[PDB]
Amino acid sequence: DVPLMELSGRAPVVRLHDIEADMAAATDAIRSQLTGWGFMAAEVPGIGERVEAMMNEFAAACRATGPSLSDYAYDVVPQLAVGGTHGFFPYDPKEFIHVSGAMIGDQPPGAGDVLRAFPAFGTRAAEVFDIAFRLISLFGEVVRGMMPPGTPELDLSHDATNLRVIHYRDVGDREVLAHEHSGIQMLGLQLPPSDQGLQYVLHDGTWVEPVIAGTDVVLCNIGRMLTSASDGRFRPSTHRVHTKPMPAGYERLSSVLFAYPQHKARQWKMVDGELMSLNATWGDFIDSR
Numbered sequence: 001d002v003p004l005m006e007l008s009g010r011a012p013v014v015r016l017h018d019i020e021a022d023m024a025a026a027t028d029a030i031r032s033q034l035t036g037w038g039f040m041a042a043e044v045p046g047i048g049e050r051v052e053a054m055m056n057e058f059a060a061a062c063r064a065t066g067p068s069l070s071d072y073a074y075d076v077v078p079q080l081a082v083g084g085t086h087g088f089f090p091y092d093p094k095e096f097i098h099v100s101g102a103m104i105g106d107q108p109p110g111a112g113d114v115l116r117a118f119p120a121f122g123t124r125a126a127e128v129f130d131i132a133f134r135l136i137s138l139f140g141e142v143v144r145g146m147m148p149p150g151t152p153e154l155d156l157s158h159d160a161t162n163l164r165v166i167h168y169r170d171v172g173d174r175e176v177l178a179h180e181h182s183g184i185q186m187l188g189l190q191l192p193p194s195d196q197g198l199q200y201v202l203h204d205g206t207w208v209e210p211v212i213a214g215t216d217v218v219l220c221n222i223g224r225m226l227t228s229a230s231d232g233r234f235r236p237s238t239h240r241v242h243t244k245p246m247p248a249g250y251e252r253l254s255s256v257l258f259a260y261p262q263h264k265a266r267q268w269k270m271v272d273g274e275l276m277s278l279n280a281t282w283g284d285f286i287d288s289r
């Protein structure tokens with residue numbers, strides 16, 4: 001069906017305590033991945049145990065009998081006048097939460113309440129957000145370094161960026177846990193999930209299955225905003241989640257950082273080797289879809 005793709009001990013090693021020097025040393029390999037595959041990968045020693053602990057707290061939060069997670073559903077959580085929707089998204093056979101940079105900062109006031117209600121999860125969600133945001137900002141300079149001179153800094157927004165933490169459960173007979181898709185935003189950073197099943201398409205249309213469950217491998221996804229800003233040079237890193245039919249009580253945990261620029265900032269594109277300034281904003285780009 002779908003061939004497995006080994007990355008552990010193949011992808012460049014990026015230590016968080018040495019992140020800038022390691023990302024500079026990794027940049028030639030990462031550029032080769034984007035060119036050759038259409039998504040990028042780095043092995044980040046220790047990140048797997050940090051993400052596993054964070055996702056285990058999220059699962060415990062999903063089960064909890066006081067405080068309760070559905071009291072922080074997105075429709076009872078303060079939202080920015082301009083922005084995406086953060087907060088809990090009750091039961092795709094999944095429930096998930098969006099922890100935004102704004103929520104970590106308690107913006108608007110009360111947005112942070114879920115992080116205080118579930119502090120074991122909330123501390124670890126902020127830890128993983130910060131790790132992921134540092135990595136993805138450096139992947140964003142790799143991609144910018146591949147583009148023409150004059151390409152603007154991606155200027156990823158801390159507050160507009162979201163960590164999505166997903167708990168798949170009661171999947172019954174599903175084969176498809178996540179349909180074929182790409183992120184609307186600039187970049188995604190897929191953190192090591194609890195199980196296999198996430199698959200990516202290669203430039204020739206072949207689907208492959210990164211070996212990432214219980215590893216320290218992270219994947220970096222091109223989103224549609226960067227496809228647009230690159231005038232179609234970098235296709236979205238289209239992906240999906242499959243499973244063989246599973247028994248009752250099967251669960252899967254996965255987390256991904258969605259990195260957004262400022263919604264109010266005007267769009268741009270590198271066209272014909274030159275910066276083209278657009279009237280529409282990044283918020284307009286989202287609203288278009």
Ligand SMILES: O=C(O)CCC(=O)C(=O)O
Nearest residue numbers: 166178193198241254256
């Ligand atoms: O469950 C996963 O591993 C990936 C989920 C994903 O692609 C997404 O939520 O956009």
Ligand SMILES: [Cl-]
Nearest residue numbers: 181182183188
């Ligand atoms: Cl996505």
Ligand SMILES: [Fe+2]
Nearest residue numbers: 181182183239
């Ligand atoms: Fe995705």
